[PDB]
Amino acid sequence: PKIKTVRGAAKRFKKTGKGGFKHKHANLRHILTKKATKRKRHLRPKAMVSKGDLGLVIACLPYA
Amino acid sequence: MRLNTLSPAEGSKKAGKRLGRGIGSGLGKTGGRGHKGQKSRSGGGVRRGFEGGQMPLYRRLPKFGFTSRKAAITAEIRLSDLAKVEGGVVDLNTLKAANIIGIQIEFAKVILAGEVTTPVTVRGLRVTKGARAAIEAAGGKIEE
Amino acid sequence: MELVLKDAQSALTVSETTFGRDFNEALVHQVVVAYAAGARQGTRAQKTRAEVTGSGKKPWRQKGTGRARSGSIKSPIWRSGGVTFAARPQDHSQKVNKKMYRGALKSILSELVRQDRLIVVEKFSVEAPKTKLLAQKLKDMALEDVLIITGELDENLFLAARNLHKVDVRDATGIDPVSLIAFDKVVMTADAVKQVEEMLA
Amino acid sequence: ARVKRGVIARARHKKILKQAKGYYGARSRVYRVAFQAVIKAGQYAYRDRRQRKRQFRQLWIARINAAARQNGISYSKFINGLKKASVEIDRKILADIAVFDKVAFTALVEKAKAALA
RNA sequence: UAGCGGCGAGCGAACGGGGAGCAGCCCAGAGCCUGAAUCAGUGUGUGUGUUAGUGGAAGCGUCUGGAAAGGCGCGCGAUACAGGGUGACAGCCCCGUACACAAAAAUGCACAUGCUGUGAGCUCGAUGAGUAGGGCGGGACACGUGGUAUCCUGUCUGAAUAUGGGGGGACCAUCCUCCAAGGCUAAAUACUCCUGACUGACCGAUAGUGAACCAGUACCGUGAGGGAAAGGCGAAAAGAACCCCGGCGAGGGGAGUGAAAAAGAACCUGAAACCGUGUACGUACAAGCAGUGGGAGCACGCUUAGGCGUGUGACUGCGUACCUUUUGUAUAAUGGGUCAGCGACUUAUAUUCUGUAGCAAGGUUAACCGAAUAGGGGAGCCGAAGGGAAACCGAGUCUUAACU
Ligand SMILES: [Mg+2]
Ligand SMILES: [Mg+2]
Ligand SMILES: [Mg+2]
Ligand SMILES: [Mg+2]
Ligand SMILES: [Mg+2]
Ligand SMILES: [Mg+2]
Ligand SMILES: [Mg+2]
Ligand SMILES: [Mg+2]
Ligand SMILES: [Mg+2]
Ligand SMILES: [Mg+2]
Ligand SMILES: [Mg+2]
Ligand SMILES: [Mg+2]
Ligand SMILES: [Mg+2]
Ligand SMILES: [Mg+2]
Ligand SMILES: [Mg+2]
Ligand SMILES: [Mg+2]
Ligand SMILES: [Mg+2]
Numbered sequence: 001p002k003i004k005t006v007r008g009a010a011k012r013f014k015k016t017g018k019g020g021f022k023h024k025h026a027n028l029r030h031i032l033t034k035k036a037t038k039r040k041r042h043l044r045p046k047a048m049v050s051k052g053d054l055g056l057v058i059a060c061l062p063y064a
Numbered sequence: 065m066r067l068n069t070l071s072p073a074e075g076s077k078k079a080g081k082r083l084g085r086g087i088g089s090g091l092g093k094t095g096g097r098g099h100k101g102q103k104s105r106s107g108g109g110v111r112r113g114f115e116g117g118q119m120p121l122y123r124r125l126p127k128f129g130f131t132s133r134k135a136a137i138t139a140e141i142r143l144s145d146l147a148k149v150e151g152g153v154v155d156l157n158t159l160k161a162a163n164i165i166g167i168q169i170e171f172a173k174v175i176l177a178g179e180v181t182t183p184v185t186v187r188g189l190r191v192t193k194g195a196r197a198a199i200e201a202a203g204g205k206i207e208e
Numbered sequence: 209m210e211l212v213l214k215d216a217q218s219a220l221t222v223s224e225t226t227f228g229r230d231f232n233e234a235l236v237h238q239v240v241v242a243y244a245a246g247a248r249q250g251t252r253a254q255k256t257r258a259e260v261t262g263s264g265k266k267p268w269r270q271k272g273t274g275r276a277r278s279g280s281i282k283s284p285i286w287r288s289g290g291v292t293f294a295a296r297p298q299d300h301s302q303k304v305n306k307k308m309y310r311g312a313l314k315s316i317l318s319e320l321v322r323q324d325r326l327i328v329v330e331k332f333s334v335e336a337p338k339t340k341l342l343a344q345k346l347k348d349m350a351l352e353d354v355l356i357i358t359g360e361l362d363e364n365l366f367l368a369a370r371n372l373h374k375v376d377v378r379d380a381t382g383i384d385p386v387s388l389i390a391f392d393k394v395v396m397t398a399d400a401v402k403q404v405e406e407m408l409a
Numbered sequence: 410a411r412v413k414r415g416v417i418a419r420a421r422h423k424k425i426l427k428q429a430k431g432y433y434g435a436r437s438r439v440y441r442v443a444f445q446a447v448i449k450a451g452q453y454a455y456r457d458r459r460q461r462k463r464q465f466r467q468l469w470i471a472r473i474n475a476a477a478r479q480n481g482i483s484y485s486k487f488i489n490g491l492k493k494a495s496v497e498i499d500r501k502i503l504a505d506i507a508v509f510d511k512v513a514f515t516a517l518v519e520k521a522k523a524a525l526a
Numbered sequence: 527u528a529g530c531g532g533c534g535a536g537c538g539a540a541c542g543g544g545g546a547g548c549a550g551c552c553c554a555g556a557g558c559c560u561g562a563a564u565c566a567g568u569g570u571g572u573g574u575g576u577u578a579g580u581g582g583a584a585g586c587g588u589c590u591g592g593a594a595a596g597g598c599g600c601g602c603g604a605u606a607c608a609g610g611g612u613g614a615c616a617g618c619c620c621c622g623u624a625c626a627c628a629a630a631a632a633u634g635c636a637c638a639u640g641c642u643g644u645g646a647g648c649u650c651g652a653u654g655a656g657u658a659g660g661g662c663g664g665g666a667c668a669c670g671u672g673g674u675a676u677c678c679u680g681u682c683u684g685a686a687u688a689u690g691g692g693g694g695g696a697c698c699a700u701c702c703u704c705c706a707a708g709g710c711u712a713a714a715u716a717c718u719c720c721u722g723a724c725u726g727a728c729c730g731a732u733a734g735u736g737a738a739c740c741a742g743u744a745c746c747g748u749g750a751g752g753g754a755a756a757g758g759c760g761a762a763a764a765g766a767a768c769c770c771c772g773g774c775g776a777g778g779g780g781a782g783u784g785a786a787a788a789a790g791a792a793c794c795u796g797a798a799a800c801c802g803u804g805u806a807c808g809u810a811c812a813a814g815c816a817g818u819g820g821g822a823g824c825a826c827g828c829u830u831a832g833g834c835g836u837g838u839g840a841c842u843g844c845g846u847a848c849c850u851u852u853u854g855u856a857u858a859a860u861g862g863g864u865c866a867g868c869g870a871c872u873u874a875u876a877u878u879c880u881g882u883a884g885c886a887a888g889g890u891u892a893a894c895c896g897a898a899u900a901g902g903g904g905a906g907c908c909g910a911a912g913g914g915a916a917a918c919c920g921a922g923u924c925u926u927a928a929c930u
Contacts, residue, residue: 011127026126054119080237246899293872453818
């Protein structure tokens, strides 16, 4: 039997064709941001071949 | 000619011999050539039971949310593997024995995968830029 | 191809035994072994029970008297109960695919080459219930008690074949890897069920 | 299924237990010897053997000294003469000859003494 | 998994799919026809189990041995050679095993029925209110009041009544589907106090039941309660007549038995810790983890020398056991009186790598069925397509007005 912390993926979750999860950024966005436009410029998720370790505790099937 | 020297020498089952190397790992224990503590011998993983500075916070950090799509799965038609296998009753509906979609779905698509044949007239909705032409060696139809 | 110089009837046939193949042990090993512990819907083994006449808790206090940190009449370390681990019944029983079981079986014509690939007829004068002289027809190979077995895609009456580990009947879709290479003399000649595939007799 | 570890029992123990140069007490009575006595020897023999080739080395060259310095001039100057002499020069243990065949040795002393520039 | 969740532990459905499996009925009523299929109790009978049972195959000589069951040689039986037994390991001795036979009586269950109950079946009926919703407080659904459907009700109220009414997850409309507030129901399904028959890569008396033993005993607690140790002579007792020492004892010596008493009853094998008796070397000016390297000498067996094996070890070079824990240990830190025997990284499901093996753009089955490891079964699972949150696009695709 194996429950996979549904919140682990209930936030930042997907496996690119290579496998590497595209994590995500955030920091200021939507919490309180006013200052610094470019800073805010956010982008679109990446990884940490340093944390993808744990960031893998989950996984299971090709879901969405 | 049997040798009365007290023996034979035939053939049967005396072994298959092999399957996988490394079929053992000091396991069952580790009581052996030394003071093998186990727990690899620090002092704070005794009965393991520990996974701390846990695997959640500061790395499972903030969120970029997600509606978690509705539209069933609706897997893509299949790897352009029509004809000589979709029954042959060209178009496509489900019970197929070399590229099937599973009946619980609804919509289809096609994608531009591998080969076709030529006989294959696909209504049954949706064409990919390519599959339109890929199945130009055929009858593109499409009822949607 | 052929089936080697013959006694009893005619000689042999040109069929296919799925080629006849070579042998890769990797298979037989994993396959015959997989078979041992196969009549195993479960099986005994409870000599365990870390929880015995475990009646009552703690004997000596914790502190005092010295004699070390005592606790629980059932203690594994102690004398009468508690087997630290051990286990339940449990399955053991494996699971072989099909491609493997059905995988490269027989080779008796290939290695026990000179030993077996015989084919005559099922033994019919064989009168209903009797073995008083099944030694009769067992001169039809004269190849003696030599483990030996059979198949005739027809449970018949043949069963007057009881003898410690002498000869056997085992018929129907019931080949059996072990019992194959567990004998040395296994003329099958279930006649027709020797079909390239469905030679399950 | 079973183990009755009791058969590899003394088979494991007698094994060493057979270390009774007396030793003494359980030092060959029980398992105090365990290894704490045999594992002992079992190391003493390593070095304090390995040691001998320097324990019989210094030995000879005490005698070797007493000899040549009893004919005049000692194990220091002595060897010097000897070494300055290619095919003409061998080395101790046999430079023990000074105890079974003096004159032989006493002759070597010569050849050494004279080689001396 | 979709959801729920200090969206934090952890909680997890259903739709739908494969199968085990299969059945629907009465009341809320009058009239008709009239005891009718319907269950259920009871007597009976067969079926079939259960409780006693019956009969059941073939061998001898010959060798060692106390004993043959084995060795050599020849001979039978064989749905029986499964197992147990007998003076050691037996298809042939002894109970069996296959195999075929059974039960005056009793009851299991099935069928057929007698009794009594019950009512079948058509005609005009008739469709379950202090009940559905609801305000309030809890409680049930994976679902924590949340935009929360839906199920209960403490409480306070309270409808339509079938050209009416509930559900389709807040809510409205729409269409789809279904009739609540009254009851009955086989089966697949859960279970071990027992009974019978079969089985074990499950134990072998610190194992296994606490208990192979007159064991929940003796034992300790006012109690509730708690909780042991303790198997073996031999093949048959043939359990040791009689004599001797002794105290009309212990105990023991002869003698008898017997293959053996070195088998003597505290009894099979009989290890260890521990204590005696015999003999040899060492030992009464000698310093310490007691061993190591020398190594004399004696005691001993040796080689028609050749400087040997063995116990010994005067004397002399080094030289402060281990464990564990620590920057670090002779350590004046723990841990060990010594032996003997138990005594701790297993197990199951699930993932992810490695080796390996089998098929390959494929690989594989689950529950289940089974002339039970076979085949049957592809529900389904994984991979060949990625991207965007998602609509959706697709070898693309995001991002942006953007084509960069
Ligand atoms: Mg240790
Ligand atoms: Mg430790
Ligand atoms: Mg499918
Ligand atoms: Mg308590
Ligand atoms: Mg026990
Ligand atoms: Mg199969
Ligand atoms: Mg040196
Ligand atoms: Mg809960
Ligand atoms: Mg009888
Ligand atoms: Mg409809
Ligand atoms: Mg016991
Ligand atoms: Mg015993
Ligand atoms: Mg005895
Ligand atoms: Mg002295
Ligand atoms: Mg010596
Ligand atoms: Mg350290
Ligand atoms: Mg200490």
